[PDB]
Amino acid sequence: HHHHFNLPPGNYKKPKLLYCSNGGHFLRILPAGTVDGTRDRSDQHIQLQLSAESVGEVYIKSTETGQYLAMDTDGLLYGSQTPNEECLFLERLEENHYNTYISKKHAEKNWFVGLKKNGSCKRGPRTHYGQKAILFLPLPV
Numbered sequence: 001h002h003h004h005f006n007l008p009p010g011n012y013k014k015p016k017l018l019y020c021s022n023g024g025h026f027l028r029i030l031p032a033g034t035v036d037g038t039r040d041r042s043d044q045h046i047q048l049q050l051s052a053e054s055v056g057e058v059y060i061k062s063t064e065t066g067q068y069l070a071m072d073t074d075g076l077l078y079g080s081q082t083p084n085e086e087c088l089f090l091e092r093l094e095e096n097h098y099n100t101y102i103s104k105k106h107a108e109k110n111w112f113v114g115l116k117k118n119g120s121c122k123r124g125p126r127t128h129y130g131q132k133a134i135l136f137l138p139l140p141v
Contacts, residue, residue, distance in 0.1 A: 002107050002108045002110075003090060003092065003102060003107060003110075004092065005056065005092070006092060006093040006094075006096075007055070007056050007091070007092060007093055008091065008092070008093045008098075008099045008138075010099075010138060012049070012050045012051050012052055012058070014140065014141065015047045015048055015049045015063050015141045016047075016048055016049075016050065016138035016139060016140065016141065017041070017046050017047065017048070017138070017139045017140075017141055018046075018048055018060070018099075018136045018137075018138055019136060019137045019138075019139050020037055020114070020115040020133070020135065020136055021098070021132060021135050021136070021137065022114070022115055022116065022117055022131075022132040022133045022135065023037070023039075023115060023116065023117035023118065023119060024039055025037025025038055025039055025115050025119045026038060026039070026040075026041070026043070026046040027046065027048065027060075027069070027113070027115065027136070028043060028045045028046045029045055029048075029062040029065065029067050029069060029079040030045055030079070031045070031065050031067075032079075033067065033078050033079040033080075034078070034079070035069065035077040035078060035079060035121050036115075036119055036120055036121055037115040037119040037120075037121070038119060039119070044064050045062060045064050045065065047062070047063045047064060047141050048060050048061060048062060048063065048069075049061050049063050050091070050138075053088060056090055056091055056092065057088050057089070057090055057091070057104060058088070058089055058091045058101075059083055059087055059088065059089075060087075060089060060101070060113075062079065065079070066081075067079035067080060067081060068080045068081075068082070068083050068084075068087040069087065069089070069113065070084065070086040070087040071086055071103040071105070071106065071111060071113070071124055072086060073086075074123070074124075075103075075106070075111055075123040075124025075125050075126075076121070076123055076124075077113065077121045085104070085105050086103070086105050088103075088104035088105070089101040089102060089103060089104060089113065090102040090103075090104055090107060094134070094135060095135070097137075098135040098136060098137060099135075099136045099137065099138055100112055100113075100134050100135065100136070101113040101134075101136070103124060106124060109124065109125070110127070110128055110129060111124030111125065111127060112124070112127040112128070112131075112133075112134040113127075113134065113136075114127045114131065114133035114134040115133055116133055122134075
């Protein structure tokens with residue numbers, strides 16, 4: 001293990017919106033496969049269904065398009081049509097409150113899912129423990 005094992009409560013029974021406290025954007029996976037964030041709660045591409053593959057390891061999938069959130073070899077988030085190694089994330093509690101998602105594939109490098117204040121996703125190498133960009137709150141749809 002390269003990381004702690006404090007897990008968030010909550011479950012995967014229903015879809016969620018992944019709200020980033022950094023700028024208040026919801027993670028969004030557009031049909032074209034791009035990933036970013038939007039503050040529009042009415043967006044049809046921010047409803048996500050998480051599922052556990054192993055305790056603390058999850059897939060994050062767009063309920064609208066079926067695409068899986070994934071992080072590529074250069075740390076960019078993209079929507080994948082099919083599940084692969086780049087789609088698994090270690091879901092952990094952070095700051096005794098938030099959910100953080102570490103790329104399983106690049107876990108030794110501490111690459112997280114994160115959104116900047118302007119709503120653009122952060123590239124893996126630019127993320128790290130301590131940032132507000134990596135902190136999310138799963139909200140009901």
